[PDB]
Amino acid sequence: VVGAVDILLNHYSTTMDVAPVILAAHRNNYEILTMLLKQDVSLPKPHAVGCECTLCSAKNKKDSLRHSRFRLDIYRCLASPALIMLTEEDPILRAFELSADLKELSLVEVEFRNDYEELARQCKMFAKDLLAQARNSRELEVILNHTSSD
Amino acid sequence: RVTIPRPHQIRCNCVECVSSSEVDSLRHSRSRLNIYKALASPSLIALSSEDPILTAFRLGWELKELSKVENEFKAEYEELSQQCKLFAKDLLDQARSSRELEIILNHRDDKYHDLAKLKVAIKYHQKEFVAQPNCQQLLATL
Amino acid sequence: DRIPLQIVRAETELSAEEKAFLSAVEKGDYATVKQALQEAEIYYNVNINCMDPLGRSALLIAIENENLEIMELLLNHSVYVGDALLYAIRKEVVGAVELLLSYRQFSEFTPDITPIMLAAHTNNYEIIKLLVQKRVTIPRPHQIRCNCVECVSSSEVDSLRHSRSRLNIYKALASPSLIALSSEDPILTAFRLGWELKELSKVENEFKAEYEELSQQCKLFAKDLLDQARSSRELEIILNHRDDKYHDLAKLKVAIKYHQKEFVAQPNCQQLLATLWYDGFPGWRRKHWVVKLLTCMTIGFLFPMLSIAYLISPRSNLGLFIKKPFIKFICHTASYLTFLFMLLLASQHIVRTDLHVQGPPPTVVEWMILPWVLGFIWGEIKEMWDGGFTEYIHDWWNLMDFAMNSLYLATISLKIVAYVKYNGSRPREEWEMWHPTLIAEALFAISNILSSLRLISLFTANSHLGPLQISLGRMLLDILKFLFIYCLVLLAFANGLNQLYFYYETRAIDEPNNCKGIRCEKQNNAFSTLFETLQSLFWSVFGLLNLYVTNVKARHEFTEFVGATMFGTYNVISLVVLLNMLIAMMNNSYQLIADHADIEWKFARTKLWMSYFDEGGTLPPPFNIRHADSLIQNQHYQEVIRNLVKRYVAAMIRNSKTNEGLTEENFKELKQDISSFRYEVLDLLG
Amino acid sequence: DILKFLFIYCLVLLAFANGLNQLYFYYETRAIDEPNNCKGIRCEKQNNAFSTLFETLQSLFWSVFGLLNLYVTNVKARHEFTEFVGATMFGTYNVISLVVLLNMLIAMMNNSYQLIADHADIEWKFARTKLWMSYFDEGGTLPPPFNI
Amino acid sequence: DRIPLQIVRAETELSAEEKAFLSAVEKGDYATVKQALQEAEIYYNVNIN
Amino acid sequence: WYDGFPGWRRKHWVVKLLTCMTIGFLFPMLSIAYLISPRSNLGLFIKKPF
Numbered sequence A: 001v002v003g004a005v006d007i008l009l010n011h012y013s014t015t016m017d018v019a020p021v022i023l024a025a026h027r028n029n030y031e032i033l034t035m036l037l038k039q040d041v042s043l044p045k046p047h048a049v050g051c052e053c054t055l056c057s058a059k060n061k062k063d064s065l066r067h068s069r070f071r072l073d074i075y076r077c078l079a080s081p082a083l084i085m086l087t088e089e090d091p092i093l094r095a096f097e098l099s100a101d102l103k104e105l106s107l108v109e110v111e112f113r114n115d116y117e118e119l120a121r122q123c124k125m126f127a128k129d130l131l132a133q134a135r136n137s138r139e140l141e142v143i144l145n146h147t148s149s150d
Numbered sequence B: 001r002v003t004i005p006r007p008h009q010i011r012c013n014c015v016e017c018v019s020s021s022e023v024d025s026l027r028h029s030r031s032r033l034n035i036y037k038a039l040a041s042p043s044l045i046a047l048s049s050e051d052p053i054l055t056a057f058r059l060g061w062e063l064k065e066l067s068k069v070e071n072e073f074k075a076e077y078e079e080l081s082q083q084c085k086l087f088a089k090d091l092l093d094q095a096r097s098s099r100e101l102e103i104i105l106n107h108r109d110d111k112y113h114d115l116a117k118l119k120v121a122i123k124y125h126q127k128e129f130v131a132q133p134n135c136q137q138l139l140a141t142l
Numbered sequence C: 001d002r003i004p005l006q007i008v009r010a011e012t013e014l015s016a017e018e019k020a021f022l023s024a025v026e027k028g029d030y031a032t033v034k035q036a037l038q039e040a041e042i043y044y045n046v047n048i049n050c051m052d053p054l055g056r057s058a059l060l061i062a063i064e065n066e067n068l069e070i071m072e073l074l075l076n077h078s079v080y081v082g083d084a085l086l087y088a089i090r091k092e093v094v095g096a097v098e099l100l101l102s103y104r105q106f107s108e109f110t111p112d113i114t115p116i117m118l119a120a121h122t123n124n125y126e127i128i129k130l131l132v133q134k135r136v137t138i139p140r141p142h143q144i145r146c147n148c149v150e151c152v153s154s155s156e157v158d159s160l161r162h163s164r165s166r167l168n169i170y171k172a173l174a175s176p177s178l179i180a181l182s183s184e185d186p187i188l189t190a191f192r193l194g195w196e197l198k199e200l201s202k203v204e205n206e207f208k209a210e211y212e213e214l215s216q217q218c219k220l221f222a223k224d225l226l227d228q229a230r231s232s233r234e235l236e237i238i239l240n241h242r243d244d245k246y247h248d249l250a251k252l253k254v255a256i257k258y259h260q261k262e263f264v265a266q267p268n269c270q271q272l273l274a275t276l277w278y279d280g281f282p283g284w285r286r287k288h289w290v291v292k293l294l295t296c297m298t299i300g301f302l303f304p305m306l307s308i309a310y311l312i313s314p315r316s317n318l319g320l321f322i323k324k325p326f327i328k329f330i331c332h333t334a335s336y337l338t339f340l341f342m343l344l345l346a347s348q349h350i351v352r353t354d355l356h357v358q359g360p361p362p363t364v365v366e367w368m369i370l371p372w373v374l375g376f377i378w379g380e381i382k383e384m385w386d387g388g389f390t391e392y393i394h395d396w397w398n399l400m401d402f403a404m405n406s407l408y409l410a411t412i413s414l415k416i417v418a419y420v421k422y423n424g425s426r427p428r429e430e431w432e433m434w435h436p437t438l439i440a441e442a443l444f445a446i447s448n449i450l451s452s453l454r455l456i457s458l459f460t461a462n463s464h465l466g467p468l469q470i471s472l473g474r475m476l477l478d479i480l481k482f483l484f485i486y487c488l489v490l491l492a493f494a495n496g497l498n499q500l501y502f503y504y505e506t507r508a509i510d511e512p513n514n515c516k517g518i519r520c521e522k523q524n525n526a527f528s529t530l531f532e533t534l535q536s537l538f539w540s541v542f543g544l545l546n547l548y549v550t551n552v553k554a555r556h557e558f559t560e561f562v563g564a565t566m567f568g569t570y571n572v573i574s575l576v577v578l579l580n581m582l583i584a585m586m587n588n589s590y591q592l593i594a595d596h597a598d599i600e601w602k603f604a605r606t607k608l609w610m611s612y613f614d615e616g617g618t619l620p621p622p623f624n625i626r627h628a629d630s631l632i633q634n635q636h637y638q639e640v641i642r643n644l645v646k647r648y649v650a651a652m653i654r655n656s657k658t659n660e661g662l663t664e665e666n667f668k669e670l671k672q673d674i675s676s677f678r679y680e681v682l683d684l685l686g
Numbered sequence D: 001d002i003l004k005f006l007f008i009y010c011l012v013l014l015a016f017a018n019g020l021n022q023l024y025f026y027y028e029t030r031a032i033d034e035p036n037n038c039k040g041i042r043c044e045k046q047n048n049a050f051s052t053l054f055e056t057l058q059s060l061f062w063s064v065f066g067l068l069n070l071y072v073t074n075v076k077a078r079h080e081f082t083e084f085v086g087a088t089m090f091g092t093y094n095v096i097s098l099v100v101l102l103n104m105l106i107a108m109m110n111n112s113y114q115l116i117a118d119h120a121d122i123e124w125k126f127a128r129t130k131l132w133m134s135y136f137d138e139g140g141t142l143p144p145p146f147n148i
Numbered sequence E: 001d002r003i004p005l006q007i008v009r010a011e012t013e014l015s016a017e018e019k020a021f022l023s024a025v026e027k028g029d030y031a032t033v034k035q036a037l038q039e040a041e042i043y044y045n046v047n048i049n
Numbered sequence F: 001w002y003d004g005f006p007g008w009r010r011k012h013w014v015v016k017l018l019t020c021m022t023i024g025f026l027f028p029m030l031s032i033a034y035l036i037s038p039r040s041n042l043g044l045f046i047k048k049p050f
């Protein structure tokens, strides 16, 4: 609604402190995300499938399904073009790296492969689109000859 | 108060009522399909059936059998059957916790903890249900 | 440099005043339009009949926006209304009927389009009815090939115009709605028109797709009307109606004549037919598969009994039993199978006679087969007589039947020419190449193949085998086309190879084991003669021709290499290229046919079933020796048709409303409605 | 589907088998007469290929693979007409079987594989579950030690 | 020549008043519909149905 | 293309076949007439494209 989101702020459920952002990102709404991210937010980091401490073992014991859905939701958020644009210094590199991760996860989480793969393709497309916006060749050079390493 | 006539069992000649087919079989056939087309509505099964999943499983099978017996109108019965099958998968997909998934897949109409419903699904060749990602995940753990 | 851009084909521009008038008509501002209309009558400053760049005048803008009010305003004043009726009909805006009511040059419509034609082309039952209510007529399309018409013969004036005019007329006559509103028997009209349109498609190579589409439109219309039947009483009245005995599924027969496959394969039609086919076998469908199997077997085994019964006491219950269609099928198929079994027995020493006696007497098995053969032929006779040469010729299989029967006839004759003229006995080896007996044996063998292959016909009956047979039949046509191309390739290389090697032909005596040809242990003289070259190239396709056959004794290396090259290129062109291409062609076809396989199958089965529904049937070997009524029938038919049309028309309208997206024009209308309302309110409140 | 196609092929085989046997059975020869006392399509020099229906059926089957030589279509007495009809029948069989039917099978199988591919995973997983379930049970020990 | 076109299976036709009544319903003019009904109750000139 | 054979489209396939055959057979005749006297009716016939 945007207007409504504004009003509410003015005054499933995989979480609640960050669920607004997680949903917005899924809603891929730049405006709403801009509003929400105004207040500092910190999505939890999806621990890798490898962990075995209660960190994950306990959860994977209480509710494996929820845990899995939770992680997918975090990634579905992190892989939102809007969020990458707003929060990442180098949007392209993030898309490259995240696409790689979302693929690995497809292999690991065989159950939700299609989901994790769609997200990967989404990231790949985003980067292509951002390149498509180049207009002169000076820009192309800056982009294709830049490194994130000192 | 509303009621949908119960369609006679497949091949129920004993009932002379089925012997009405002699008169206006066309009507007989259409009327039957209409009844099944209704009993196979996801929403009706949801509102009326006590166990929506099991009802769908069973109805989807009967409809398949009818598809064979009623050579004509086969496609219709087959479509209605798929509607039922997908409905069951869709309800399963709406599960959010493992506790739920286990309660559903291990329920015995009437031991428990024997994945009774999953077994019924395999019996009724409910492939989509048995292949649902979350269901496959549980099985793997086992 | 910089290419300048100017308007090369200019046209008068609209005065600002005129431009405003048209703008108002588009926004729905009745007041301004009204004012301008009144002012113009005084100061003559705006050409009420002005036209936008796209050629749209005020009335046309109003019509498109469907503002009937502004339309009347314009019409009240003297606005040119040329072709306006046509634009309204196209937009399908009933209400613009005011155009019809009111009474007193760029057109998007060709000059031949009359109001009724366009209405038909749009298929709006309501608009068409309105027009039909007033005296309207559509020109009659001269029959195909009507050069005698002279007028049509006078197509030289404008072939394009003539062709278009014709398509337009047919595109109108082929409207489901007009057929429904104006035809006494809508179903037959669609059947006949569908046929004509198909034929026209062939004659008019160009415009073929259009004519074909129209034909399908007609074929669907008929199927759809049938689908609206709600009781078996109706289906009967419809399927048994005779245009003018009845109760003969007369209309179903006409449908087959006109190849209305969809109509025939309609579920209910099939259901009625099944009842008739499986008479005397209540619930043959629900019976267990094995149960049915046994019952079928039993019936078949008693075929001689049943046949005889009917031959003797037709009235007897047994005599009556054979008359049932499914039974005839069982009995008639059993008879054949036994005939084929007898054939097998003919070649198994059963009554094998000396292989050294020329002109042998007919063996016992042979005697037994005779009756069947004569019968088959007699049956075909009845087929041709009843159906007519054209009809009999139509069925491809009957051709097969013809060949098989002729071969058998020839075998019999040769047996006679041998029984007589060859009473002696000689070692088979001594027998000449054309000894009547040898030729007869060959012909019988050839027929034995055709007879057995005929069994494929029975596949149509099965729900599993039938569908496949149809698909195969379609793909076979493609193979035929390919064969033509291959034959040219084969001949091309055949000529070349014969042209290269005919110089090195050798005598059989010179050859080893006095064998000359490709069918010897040591293949030789493969390309020496054209006939052998053709054979050799054929067998090479299957890898049965060795490579050493491309060498010459004298060992002329150059010639040999050229010869091998030709053979090699032939192999590549045929096997690697042409063949793999046939596969591609067959594949494409398959997918295509696959979708309409059922309707192609059921149509066939119906024809088969309909064949037995006849009065006279008997297995091949055991052949041995008031106007008031019509009026009533027509009344009932018309009543049913009235109901079926009403149901159909309604259904179509529903489908359109629920399965048609909102187009841009709709947006524009909605916008105008809001705008017009706004202006009105603002004026009243202002 | 392949099975259905096979039925048609069989019918064709039977037909040509009956025909061929019908023409060459007049010219059957003894094994002793045959070189190396070998009679059949499986001898160094194929012989009496169409002499008997059983042999004719075998010969036609192997022809599908090109393992049947063409010299088998000639009779020793050398009756030209018969041999030609025989070769022509054999040839027509080859065309109908290899060029036509065989190729058609390819088309049919391509059509189905396409469809099956649409629902491959669900099918596989349903199957896999059934397998996994079988072991999920408790009555299970390997076959060698299965019996006490 | 020309093929005359007529309505073969004819059906009763709506009077002008009746046509207007139904037309109002398609435009949603409650007032006119209401009036037509009331008048029909009095002058019995339109078959509401 | 079909000038000289108006209605060729309407012509029965057999009829067509017949016409084509005759012309082809007489090809030498038509070929010569043209050479001798293009103006000759026969000379005119070969000029038609079909």
Ligand SMILES: CC(C)CCC[C@@H](C)[C@H]1CC[C@H]2[C@@H]3CC=C4C[C@@H](OC(=O)CCC(=O)O)CC[C@]4(C)[C@H]3CC[C@]12C
Pocket (backbone or CB within 6 Å): C333, C337, C455, C458, C459, C460, C461, C462, C463, C465, D007, D010, D011, D014
């Ligand atoms: C495969 C080899 C052994 C050749 C076998 C030759 C015959 C014994 C087969 C070949 C085709 C068969 C026929 C194929 C078609 C049918 C239709 C079938 O009917 C149905 O499938 C549906 C029920 C109905 O006919 O109404 C009855 C058996 C029959 C005659 C089959 C009888 C057995 C036939 C003659």
Ligand SMILES: [Ca+2]
Pocket (backbone or CB within 6 Å): C380, C383, C397, C398, C401
């Ligand atoms: Ca016949």
